[PDB]
Amino acid sequence: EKSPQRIMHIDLDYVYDENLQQMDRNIDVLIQRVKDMQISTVYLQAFADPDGDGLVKEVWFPNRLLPMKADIFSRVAWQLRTRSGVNIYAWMPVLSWDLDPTLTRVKYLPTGEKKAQIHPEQYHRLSPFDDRVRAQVGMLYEDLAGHAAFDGILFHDDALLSDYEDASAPAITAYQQAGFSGSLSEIRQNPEQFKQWARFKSRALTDFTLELSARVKAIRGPHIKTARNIFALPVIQPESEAWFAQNYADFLKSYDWTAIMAMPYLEGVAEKSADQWLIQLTNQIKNIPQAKDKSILELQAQNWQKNGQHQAISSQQLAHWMSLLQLNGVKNYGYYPDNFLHNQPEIDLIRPEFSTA
Template identity: 50%
Template sequence: METMIMRNLILAWVFIGLALAVPARAGDFIVLCYHDVQRSLDDPDGMSVTLDSLIAQFSWLEENGYRVLSIDDLLRAQQAEHPLPDKTVMLTFDDGYTSFYTKVFPLLKAFEFPAVLAVVGGWTEVPEGSLVDYGDKQVPRERFMSWEQLREVAASGLVEIASHSYDLHHGVLANPQGNEQPAMTARRYDAERDRYESAAAYEARLRADFAHNAALFEKHLGARPRVMVWPYGKYNRLAQDLAAEFGMPIALTLDTGPNDPKELGAVRRVLLMNDPPLANFVWQMHNPLWQRPEPVRVMHVDLDYVYDPDPAQQETNLGLLLDRVLQMGVNTVYLQAFADPDGDGVADALYFPNRHLPVRADLFNRVAWQLQTRTGVKVYAWMPVLAFTLGETRDQVQSWQADGPAAPDPEQYRRLSPFAPDALRLVEEIYEDLATHAAFSGILFHDDALLSDFEDAHPAALAAYAAAGLPEDIGAIRADPALQRRWTRLKMQTLHTFTGRLAQRVRDWRPDLKTARNLFALPVLERASESWFAQSLPRFLEHYDYTAIMAMPYMEGAEDPEAWLTELVRRIAETPGALDKVVFELQSVDWRHDNAPVPSSVLAQYMRLLAREGAKHYGYYPDDFFNNQPGVEELRPLMSLRTYPYLP
């Protein structure tokens, strides 16, 4: 299991090869993450470096004026006692291999470099001559350092011994289909009782582990650990809070990016894999990955296509999807997490355990995990914002009528009012349940997050308008252009605020979450139409990591699709930096004409047009993996990032 979980997690979630980088700003620092060090490389997991490589890298850092930091240096910088100079780096070594004592420690003394060594407490308690349960295999206890060796390196003043957990460096059963996921963050699934670990039991498990390891360190080293190094780089807000409670306010992740010494609760690290040659190491040091992000290529997938009441057929369907994603070569999948078999865009059930709606199947976690670990893509959970079958009819968005009472608009999605607090609380809890029961990289907010220029006339909305100094009479607002502009801005901000709250609920469990939100094309092409949707491209760019614009000319009834797409890209490009954050979602089906497939050659032509006009990110919806629609052969040259110049 160690081989499977560690390799798959790293290749899928931290798929960055040699993602080393210089700090982005003065005072920032970077942290390098090493594992085992060998004289000659025999490492099927790609997690080791050779001794010669390590010597060359240390020598390069010294010769090029890098300052190697200790934990005390960081703490002093955090307290603003001593600002960090430029070109600062920290060295970390995970798992406590004996090679650290025999190979790395002599180098640290020779170069006078400090380092952090992360130790799994449970492995140290295995008797000499016995075997350590190292994931899915057993390895000799002698592969890991003894307490005597740990005391020696700690006494040198060069090495900070960090906690790598007592017994959380492994996987636990995390869904009914049998996937094992990191014990630190996964809610354990009990197959015999067909239920998940409760929130209280999960917290108790983590608390007991942290307490045990702290006591073990105190017993053998005379001090409790000050630093937590998350196994597999996975953590959540609860784990962070517990680490701080047990005296470890500094925690090291495998998130990517530069670090600010004032923010040490989630220090980002870059993982050295596959024993990089010195030339690669140097090139990457001067070309930081996060300053040169790769293009986004998206397949937008309906989980309803994977679902089947027959578990065997469902697994077959999943296999077809995985093969399809690998063949297409994309790096991102927007994966439906709600059930919508009738296609009305409203969530009647969900694909994950939750408190408020039926579970059509406990499927999202299984598919998301397989996609991430088997194909290396980033998975965004595609979720409604307001379109849930929840609460009473009175909780729904109400459309103002000049000649009658307000009522839901039958031409729009059935949505909950973003001003109805009780209904929104239920949605927040659904998002929290999603985050606790599945591992994923981002959220795609569905296109249901809109309010027309007749909405919302819900009583709570009218009260919010009054509180903002607007009339409670929508007719009066619509009659005054200045009031209507204020009203539109208020509605926009209400939707942004709510999606921000939803994202925060998820980030408590998935801290490195990215966000994307669907935007209709008309507010970009016709500025006056912003009030028809309560959507605005500049505001989307401020609030989300990506804006997934619905670049769907057939849906919009465009007479000349190519001219329409060209104009859309050019309008977006008028906003500085917009093309860095906009994903163009093309349609692969013409819903206006009996759901006829858009020919793959035409879709490929549109992708070439987008790229020619300067679009950086694009994809399509939907993907029909049963019928090879759109065709892999036609689209792979335009979708795949597994070819030069994108292959890492």
């Protein structure tokens, strides 16, 4: 991978159509669009997410555990790799799979309540502390690896845990065997243990992704690159690892690419403060030598609204943000999501700040 990295992060939900001939045309237009953009890399959705409900029930590749909505991941991937001139990372959930209900789910401990529960507004994650979960998610990644050729894996941002998670019984067991108390409330009120517990959860998640990476590499070979999405807060306010279980230095040591969700509006930043926020993000990154050379900053191309809808970020604003990143010494970047159906973002408007050529 010769620098700079310039990433289009692409959902296939848009490309899918019940009409095979329409889906044909959609794929052709998408292939041409990526070709015309002239960038280095596509992060390509391997799972279906038609409702954005935080749980994957269907995927775009044949496999042993979940329905295949349409066999299109490999079809799009090989054409992007040969015709559009890009590396492809298979974008996969780490935890949020609609598998066997007897599999342990991540739970949180509600204030004033005895029994752990599933947090309503979080990804519907399986617990990485359940060995059956590790095996089954492993099978999904092996099925992907066996049925499609690609250049990398992008691990989804659903590999996170809050400061009241994971409260499930297998997680509790894991903490106890690691030397912590079985009571989350107790851990949370101990200065040293709370710090250590956050770190433990971060490593647990990272280790799980590395197990999955090894499984993929066993099949496709060791040349496969790894990337993982990290939330902005663990980068800019590292103490936030306490409620994300993500650690930036850990990502930098563990993956080829750390894909930072550099998305001010997602983080509640006022429109007029977005430049300052992006600049401060780049500043924090440069506190770690070579971090920028191992990080991709993913800008948002949509603004996601409270009531479930989203609207486009203007292409001119996206281009300005890209200009800003370059001027602050950040050369590796991209955006999410892409919408070929409406040429959003507008190829002609963003290419001068985006394209490698």
